[PDB]
Write a protein that binds this DNA or RNA. Structure first.
Length: 180
DNA sequence: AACAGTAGCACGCTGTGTATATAATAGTGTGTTGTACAGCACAACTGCGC
């Protein structure tokens, strides 16, 4: 082994606590998009940490694109400050990470059909529909996308340890189904 | 007759469908409920006439 998964995307939610006028928000923000007809939220962005926020009239906000939990909270506080600077009585509350995505490379090809047959109740593999095997782990409850190349995607985690836990649990199985 | 330029065709590369999680919230679609409108031979009935 020796491989440890790399975090790729962190999704979080934040309650600003006050109602927002989206045209005002979009108008005053330096990096905003807002087309009511397409989606009901201002799509705001900041350069550091590089992230994207979906800002709603209710004052709720979704922050995505961060590569670390630190970066997620940091960028979230920053978006909240922007809203304040524009003039609303916003508050940075209820910061919570909802989804963590990770990925790695085991460095060997995998026999997906064998794995799907062996771990049938957790696996779903339809190569004509999507080339990767969808593995639904029980403990921890994580979803893994397994590819012939040996590249692995882990998602559905609320905490970093779950990403790490799942990979540790899957590695022996990937080894059992290697090609070379 | 030869050379240069322009147009057309073919090939290669980049971008967007499929799948995973996860939050946000008002809309859109579907289903259900309510209201309104549109071959014998003999056996029995029944029908007609006295």
């Amino acid at each position: 082994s020796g491989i440890v998964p790399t975090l790729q995307n962190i999704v979080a939610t934040v309650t600003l606590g006050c109602r927002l006028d989206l045209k005002t928000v979009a108008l005053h923000a330096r990096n905003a998009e807002y087309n009511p007809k397409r989606f009901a939220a201002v799509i705001m962005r900041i350069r550091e940490p590089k992230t994207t926020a979906l800002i709603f009239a209710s004052g709720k906000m979704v922050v995505t694109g961060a590569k670390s939990e630190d970066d997620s909270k940091l960028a979230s506080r920053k978006y909240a400050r922007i809203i304040q600077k524009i003039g609303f009585a916003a508050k940075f509350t209820d910061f919570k990470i909802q989804n963590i995505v990770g990925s790695c490379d085991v460095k060997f090809p995998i026999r997906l059909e064998g794995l799907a047959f062996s771990h049938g109740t957790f696996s779903s593999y339809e190569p004509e529909l999507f080339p990767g095997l969808i593995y639904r782990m029980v403990k921890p409850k994580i979803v893994l996308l397994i590819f012939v190349s040996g590249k692995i995607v882990l998602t559905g985690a609320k905490q970093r340890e779950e990403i790490y836990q799942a990979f540790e649990a899957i590695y022996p199985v990937l080894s059992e189904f290697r090609k070379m």
